[PDB]
């Protein structure tokens with residue numbers, strides 16, 4: 001329980017040579033990164049598999065049912081997904097810093113205080129789900145498609161409040177460096193999800209409504225399974241003191257800290273969505289929509305590995321800033337960035353080697369395979385950029401820089417990325433290469449700013465700022 005972190009700090013405090021000290025602080029760091037990032041990827045892959053399993057099981061009832069599962073997941077759910085996870089960012093930085101400062105008693109307070117805030121946030125998301133039929137026909141979709149997706153969206157209204165409890169519990173167990181139980185109950189519920197969705201759809205005949213209800217039901221099985229763990233777990237007897245009335249105090253404070261990360265995700269959900277819509281306005285958008293969707297799907301599939309390093313870099317900096325280990329935090333930021341950078345290099349190598357094959361996997365098109373292969377050099381740059389940007393955003397969450405990063409991300413995306421992509425794409429007639437270059441240029445500037453800031457960071461002041469943050473939340 002934080003003993004390894006103390007040892008790493010002790011190792012840096014020695015007269016031993018730099019190379020001997022580097023090898024033997026990297027080994028203890030690499031062991032901590034692996035014990036955190038490996039189950040984090042396994043959790044997101046199994047959970048997204050349920051979103052794919054529900055999309056697959058519901059899509060086998062007709063082409064209208066598949067469009068309902070696709071438009072419901074990417075249209076309104078992806079908007080509701082980024083809003084719930086954004087508020088769960090303040091409980092991520094508060095639990096990790098408190099777990100490092102041995103204030104285990106208030107870890108359960110942050111869980112409930114995040115649940116109350118997220119449960120109130122899921123109320124505006126509920127009325128949007130009810131009128132999902134009206135917003136789809138407003139975008140021009142057919143009434144039969146809008147009513148079909150709404151019924152599928154009607155079944156996802158319990159998935160909203162399931163997020164409001166799963167995300168605080170996820171970051172709660174993440175701070176204590178215990179993410180293994182979450183990966184195994186998700187594996188079991190997936191078998192329960194595939195089995196129950198097969199019984200509800202094929203035998204009960206509830207249609208696409210029951211298909212989305214089984215998804216929302218399975219999401220509530222991992223919520224109950226995660227809560228009954230912390231009640232019986234021995235590593236959670238110091239961190240979960242039980243239900244407390246203090247969770248209702250200082251709700252607006254949790255709103256202000258988490259508001260930065262929430263806007264960063266929903267706008268980015270629209271930012272990529274705007275980049276797709278803008279690609280439809282380019283000259284010859286017939287192939288620009290398919291090629292960009294292939295590269296972004298590869299970018300999205302490669303992004304699933306980056307979120308594991310994001311969770312690891314977040315808890316490491318949080319646990320070290322709370323335990324007053326500034327040199328260990330400056331090393332964890334460096335170590336996560338380097339290992340994730342080498343992974344992004346391997347991701348770019350595989351894409352460049354299979355530049356002609358990856359296009360046929362998503363859609364069989366000969367002219368599409370050429371256009372995708374032409375954008376693979378640009379996609380490889382985005383993959384390398386997506387191997388440093390999320391880990392620098394994860395350490396910024398651990399330091400509480402969520403407001404500073406949100407200003408930079410929105411400014412680099414909407415203020416720099418979008419105008420550069422439209423100027424290169426439309427005015428300069430570079431097509432999809434101009435859009436992707438503008439998206440690259442946006443991510444480049446963001447990473448550069450964060451890199452200079454993070455490496456010029458006074459980690460002594462971040463430790464003091466972590467004490468002030470924990471002390472103020474303890475007073476109220």
Ligand SMILES: CCCCCCCC/C=C/CCCCCCCC(=O)OC[C@H](O)CO
Nearest residue numbers: 115116117119120123245248249250251476
């Ligand atoms: C849909 C699910 C919703 C889930 C959440 C429902 C409750 C949210 C309400 C909280 C404030 C009102 C209730 C608490 C009123 C007393 C608060 C209190 O003790 O205030 C102390 C004061 O702030 C000095 O420290």
